[PDB]
C-alpha cells in the first residue's frame, strides 16, 4: 500500500480550483493508498494573513475536507502547525537547498512580482513543502500542475540528502490530473484561479452562494466572437469555462460544443453557474454541519496524534544521519 | 533578575577566540543572571559538517562548556536541536524578516563569498539566531564584536512582530566585552579568529596541545619592524597577540609594551605560548573528566527539559498572535 501526501493552504476559502486539481481526487484516493492530507497553515504565513482569518480559515478547510467526503478514519487529516516535526525537517532541507534552487522557482517569482518586500519564508517555501511531504515517506503527491515544480525540486532534495548522507527518503512522484489541472481565473483566463487573488471576481469559493456565483460566473472574460468552441490560444476564457463545465457536468467537451451550438455566452454562463451551484449545494450543507461541532476539533487532535508519531521518527533518523544531537 | 541567552556553534572545536570574547564572560554572569547556554547545532549545519564530527563537537562544546566553570545549577546548558520550539519560531520569524535584510547581513556576505552553491539555510542563520533569543524574553546577549548586526535585526525583528501583532518579545540587548571583542587570525590579523577557518594555523582551540601552541603562536604573521608596540593600523598581528597576552595574563598593553623593550617577537611569541598553554591546562583536565562520563549526557538531559518548557509556551503565544493552528 503506497503513501499519499498533499496539502493545502489556509490562506482563504478554497476554489473550484483546488477542488477540480486536486481534493475531488483526495475523495477516491483515500480508499487506495494510506493517505495524508494537510492544512499547511506553516505555508500560508509566507505572505501576510490577519490572525483572526487565519484561524478561521483554519477550520473552514478543516470542514471542507470533511464536507467533501474525507473520510477520517481512511485518511489522516491534520495541521501543519500542529506537527512540530514539519518545521524541524523544513531546517534541515533548507542546509540541504541551494539560493539559486529556490529564486527560479516559478511560484516564488510570480509572487514575489509586486516586490517592494518580501518575506524570507515566501522564498524557503520549497524546503516547508519537501518536509510536508518526505516526512511519510511518501510515494505519490496528487496536486495541480502549478506545484509540479515544487515537487521535481523535493525529489532533488531527497536524492541529495540520500547521497550525501544515506539512502532513507522516498522518492515522490507526482500524480497530476488528465483534466483540470489548471483552472484559470475568470478575470484573467491567462492566469491561474488563486484562493488569495486580489480580486474575488477571479474566483469561485467551495461557499459562494447562488447569487454570487450567478455574478462571477456572468462576470467571468470572454472574447466577441459569439461562438462557444474549445480553443485556448484564441478563446481562453470560453475554453476555461467549457473546462469547469466539462469536469463537473461529467459531457465532454464537444459535447458540449455541440448542445450549445448556435447559443450565446449569456446562456452558456447561466447554466454554467447552476452547474456550479449545484455541484457546491450538498458540499456546503455538510460544512455548516462541522463548522457547528466539537467533532471537527477531535478529528485534528487524533489526526495530529498519528502524523507526529510518524513524522517525529523521521525527524529522529535525519537528525541522526547529519549528525545533529545525540 | 534579567534574563542571558548566548549560543555557540559546534562546527569544530571552540577557539580562544569563542573563549575571550564569550565563553569566559559566561562563567561570570551565571551567578548574576539567568542564564541560558546553548550548544547551535542547527545553526552549524548551515554549512557542510561531516555527520562523525558534529555528533563529536557537539559533545565536547558541552563538556567545554562545564569544563570552563559553567555551573548545570546555575544556568541551563542545552542542545538546540533538542528543543524542537528554535525551528518553530525560526519559520514564523523567517515570514517576519524580508529576503532583502537577510542579504545584507555581513556574516552570510563573508561566509557566501567563496560561492559556487551557498545553502539557504546560511541565508537563514539570523532568523534561527533571533528564535534562539527571543524564545526565553532575554533581557541581554553577551557576544563578541562578529555577532553585533545578528542582534540589532533580532531587534528589528521583534519590534516588527510586537507592533504588526501584539507587544510579546522582550527587546534584547547586545553585551559585547570592552577587551577581545574580536580576536583575529593567527595567520590573518585583518580577519577574525574563526574555529571553521581551512587553516588550522589560525585559531588555537582549547584542546591543542603544548607543542601545538607553540608552533601556531611562533607561526603567527607579524611585520619586520622588531618592535613589540599596539598599533593595530601598522602592527595588526602583533597588536593581536598583545591583547591576546594582556586578556589572559592579566598585565595591561603598556605593561607588557614595557616588560618587552629591546625584545625580540621570538621571545615575545615563545612566552605567550606558555602563557595561553598555562590558561588551558586545567581547562583540558577537567573536559577530559567530562568526555568521560554520563553525567554529561544527564547534564544535558535536564537542560533541554527545562528550555523545553520555557520555549515551547512561547512558540504558543507566537502561533496565537499570528493566528497559527486552532
Ligand atoms: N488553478 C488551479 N487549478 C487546479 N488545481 C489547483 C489550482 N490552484 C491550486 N490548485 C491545487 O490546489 C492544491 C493546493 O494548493 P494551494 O493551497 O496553494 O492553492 P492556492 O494557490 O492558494 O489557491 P488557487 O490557486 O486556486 O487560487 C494544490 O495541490 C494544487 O496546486
Ligand atoms: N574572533 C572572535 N573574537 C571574539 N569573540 C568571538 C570571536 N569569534 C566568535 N566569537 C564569539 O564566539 C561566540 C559564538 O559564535 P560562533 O559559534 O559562531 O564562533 P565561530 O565563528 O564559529 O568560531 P571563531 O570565530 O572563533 O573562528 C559568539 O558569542 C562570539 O561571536
Ligand atoms: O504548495 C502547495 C500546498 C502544499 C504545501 N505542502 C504540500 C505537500 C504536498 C502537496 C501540496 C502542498
Ligand atoms: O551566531 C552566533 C552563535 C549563536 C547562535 N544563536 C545565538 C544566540 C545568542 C548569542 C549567539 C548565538
Redesign the interface.
Known amino acids: 500500500m503506497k503513501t499519499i501526501f498533499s496539502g493545502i493552504q489556509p490562506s482563504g476559502v478554497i476554489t473550484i480550483g483546488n477542488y477540480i486539481g486536486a481534493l475531488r481526487q483526495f475523495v477516491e484516493l483515500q480508499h487506495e493508498y494510506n493517505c495524508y492530507f494537510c492544512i499547511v ?2 505555508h500560508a ?2 505572505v501576510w ?7 478561521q480559515n ?2 473552514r478547510l478543516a470542514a471542507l475536507y470533511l464536507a467533501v467526503g474525507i473520510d477520517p478514519t481512511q485518511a489522516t487529516l491534520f ?1 501543519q ?2 506537527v ?2 514539519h ?2 525537517a ?3 532541507l ?7 534552487e ?1 529564486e527560479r522557482m516559478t511560484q516564488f517569482k510570480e509572487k514575489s512580482a509586486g516586490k517592494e ?8 517555501y520549497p ?2 513543502m519537501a518536509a510536508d511531504i518526505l516526512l511519510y515517506n511518501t510515494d505519490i503527491v496528487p496536486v495541480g500542475e502549478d506545484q509540479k515544480q515544487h515537487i521535481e525540486l523535493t525529489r532533488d532534495l531527497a536524492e541529495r540528502f540520500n547521497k550525501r ?1 544515506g539512502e532513507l527518503f522516498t522518492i515522490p512522484e507526482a500524480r497530476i490530473p488528465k483534466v483540470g489541472a489548471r483552472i484559470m481565473s475568470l478575470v484573467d483566463p491567462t492566469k491561474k484561479m488563486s484562493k488569495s487573488d486580489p480580486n474575488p471576481k477571479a474566483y469561485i469559493t467551495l461557499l459562494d452562494d447562488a447569487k454570487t456565483i450567478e455574478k462571477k460566473i456572468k462576470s467571468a472574460v470572454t472574447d466577441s466572437e459569439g461562438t462557444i468552441r474549445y480553443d485556448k490560444e484564441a478563446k481562453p476564457g470560453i475554453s476555461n469555462l467549457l473546462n469547469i463545465y466539462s469536469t463537473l457536468s461529467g459531457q465532454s467537451i464537444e459535447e458540449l460544443e455541440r448542445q450549445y451550438e448556435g447559443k450565446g455566452y449569456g446562456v452558456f454562463k447561466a447554466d454554467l453557474a447552476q452547474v456550479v451551484i449545484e455541484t457546491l449545494r450538498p458540499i456546503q450543507e455538510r460544512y455548516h454541519h462541522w463548522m457547528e461541532s466539537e467533532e471537527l ?1 477531535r478529528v ?1 487532535d487524533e489526526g495530529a496524534e498519528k502524523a507526529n508519531r510518524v513524522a517525529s521518527e523521521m525527524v529522529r533518523k535525519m ?1 541522526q ?6
Chains 1, 2 share one sequence.
Open positions: 497553515d506553516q504565513i509566507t494573513q490577519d490572525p483572526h482569518e487565519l484561524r483554519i477550520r495541521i502547525s500542529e512540530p516535526a518545521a524541524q523544513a531546517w534541515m533548507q542546509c540541504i537547498v541551494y539560493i539559486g529556490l518586500a518580501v518575506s524570507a519564508g515566501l522564498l524557503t524546503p516547508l548522507y476539533d485534528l537528525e544521519a547529519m549528525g545533529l544531537g545525540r
